[PDB]
Structures are given as structure tokens and as C-alpha cells.
Amino acid sequence: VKEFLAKAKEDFLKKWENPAQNTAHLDQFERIKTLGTGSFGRVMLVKHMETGNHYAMKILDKQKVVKLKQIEHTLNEKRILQAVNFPFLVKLEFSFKDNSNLYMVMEYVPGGEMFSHLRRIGRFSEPHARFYAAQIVLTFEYLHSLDLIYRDLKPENLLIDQQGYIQVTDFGFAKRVKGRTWTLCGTPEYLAPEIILSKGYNKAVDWWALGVLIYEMAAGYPPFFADQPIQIYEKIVSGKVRFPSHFSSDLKDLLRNLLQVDLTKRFGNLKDGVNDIKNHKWFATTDWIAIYQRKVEAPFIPKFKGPGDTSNFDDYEEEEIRVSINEKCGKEFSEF
């Protein structure tokens, strides 16, 4: 672990200091379908005509990125993904840009969103939720050791691969930070108290979101919901939480420390750090090296009817890709 991290830190640092640029072009990829959308971009299944491989390509509208003030964030995302590497992290295979857009081509995860499976099934069993939480735990230990805070953990951003393992996606808010950070960002339901109270925060927000994930995974619904953020924010900064009746005691307990407003008392953010999590009762049956080695029995295996299948993704209105004859935001994205 400490031997693993060190080494891993060195590869990331190498790539982090000399990030790669313009390694592909649009015309080399064949457009096949939209599997996700956003406020400033969409995600599409794509096939690389030279290798005949299927990739996930994320197209970002540079003008939409500016209007929403996400230039730095976008520059952060690409810089971190071309340099990180982990069994549970989607892979940034290529990156480039054109007059109108920024592009990030990655490994395609055909299993679909945990969100979907979670919604359809209602809720996961603790052994099932525990299996994915472990993957998020190690991933956060990885990233964190490299001074990266993830900041956008949520079913919607978690993907199930073929072997049934999770793959974290979306690094729009990821950021290399040694020391306090202040940017207000994430998704309401998963916002730590420090964030909503505009007080500067650290990696500890990734552990609070972890506890949110787990609960939602074991209960079927979020520990703090309402039909409008403010009302959700009050629940969050309230210091109160209610657990379902089936939630085991170890589970209620683990969630109690994870969902701790007192960030000087919140698991993960303590002296023994992550170990207060990994060594916690609810995790007593978990073989961490096993998980890392992808040798543990997946609770559920999504079905693939063939290479480039997409039944596990919803249908989105398709919109043609447009590339103006003029560069739109040159200097802002020069380093992309």
C-alpha cells in the first residue's frame, strides 16, 4: 500500500509535470451514439477506425465551459486523467480539440450507470453495496495520496464494467490540492457541510460523499432529499440522520462517523485516516487486496449482447457535432 502508492505517485508526477497534448483527431473516430449529456457537453460511443475499438468520447463546448466558469476545472480534468491510472478509474486514452470543442476519448464501460441499476432494483444488499464502496474507498486512497480531491461522487458518475466492477467517471471537479480549497461545487444531495457553509474544505469532503453513496446504495434513497437544494442543505447541515430498519448496526455506525458534520471527528479525516474506514466492522469481511486485484466475486454482472452494445444506457436526443470555421477560445484552452 505505502509501497504501491509511492511508486504510483511517481508515475503520476511524471505525467502530471509533462502532460500529453493533441494525440488524436475527430475524423479518426466514427460517431455512434450519445450515452450521456451535460450542461456543457455530451458523451458518445465512438469507434476508432484504425484499431476498430470502441471508446467513450466526451465533447465539451468551449463556449459553454466559459459561460459556466469551468475553464480551470476543465483544464484540471484533462491534466489529471492523462496522468492517473487505477483499476477503478476510467482511462483517458486520447485528447484533442478543434475550433469549437475539447475532446476526451476514453475506455468504454458498457455496463451502464450504477444510478440506473440502483433505481431499477430499488436498493442493493449490504454485501453488494459493500463491494462497490470498497472500490470507492481504495480509489479515494489512491487519488488522495496524490493530492487530488474528487468532489463529484454519485451513482450517475459510477459505471459498471464487464467483470462487474465500478469505474469512476467525470473529473470536472477533480483538482490537485495540497491545503484548503474553496470552490463551491458538486451535486446537492452529496454536498458536505463545510462546502455548503462556505468555509474552505479538504479531502474530508470525499469521505462524506462516500457515506452518502453507501447509504443511498443500501437504502434506495438519499439520507438528505427534498425537492429543492436549500431544503436539502438544511437537512445536511442539521446534524441529524435517519437509517432504514434493515440497516445493520455496523452499517448505521459506519455511516454515523462518515456522515459527521464535525470534520474534526469525521472518519477518513482523522489521524489514522482511511484505516478507520477499512478497519471498520462493516468492512470486516472485505479482503482489500482481493478487491484491488479484481478477484472478488462480483454481486452482479451486467449483460453485453456484443461489442459496442448500449442497452444499459438511456437514449438521448442526438445532435450533430458542429465545428465553426473560427477558433472560439484559443488562449483560455491553449494548454489543452
Binding site: 450542461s39 459556466l68 476545472h73 463529484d152 454519485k154 461545487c185 458538486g186 437504502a219 434506495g220 434513497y221
Partner: peptide
């Protein structure tokens, strides 16, 4: 039931992030 109040709310779909 909470599960019901949940399912009856306008928050069971994909929840977008707040850039600002």
C-alpha cells in the same frame, strides 16, 4: 414510507451538479 416520499419527489432522476 420514506421510500414513498422519495419516489413521489422530483428528485429521483439524474441530479445535475452545481457549477456555481
Amino acid at each position: 414510507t420514506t421510500y414513498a416520499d422519495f419516489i413521489a419527489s422530483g428528485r429521483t432522476g439524474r441530479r445535475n451538479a452545481i457549477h456555481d
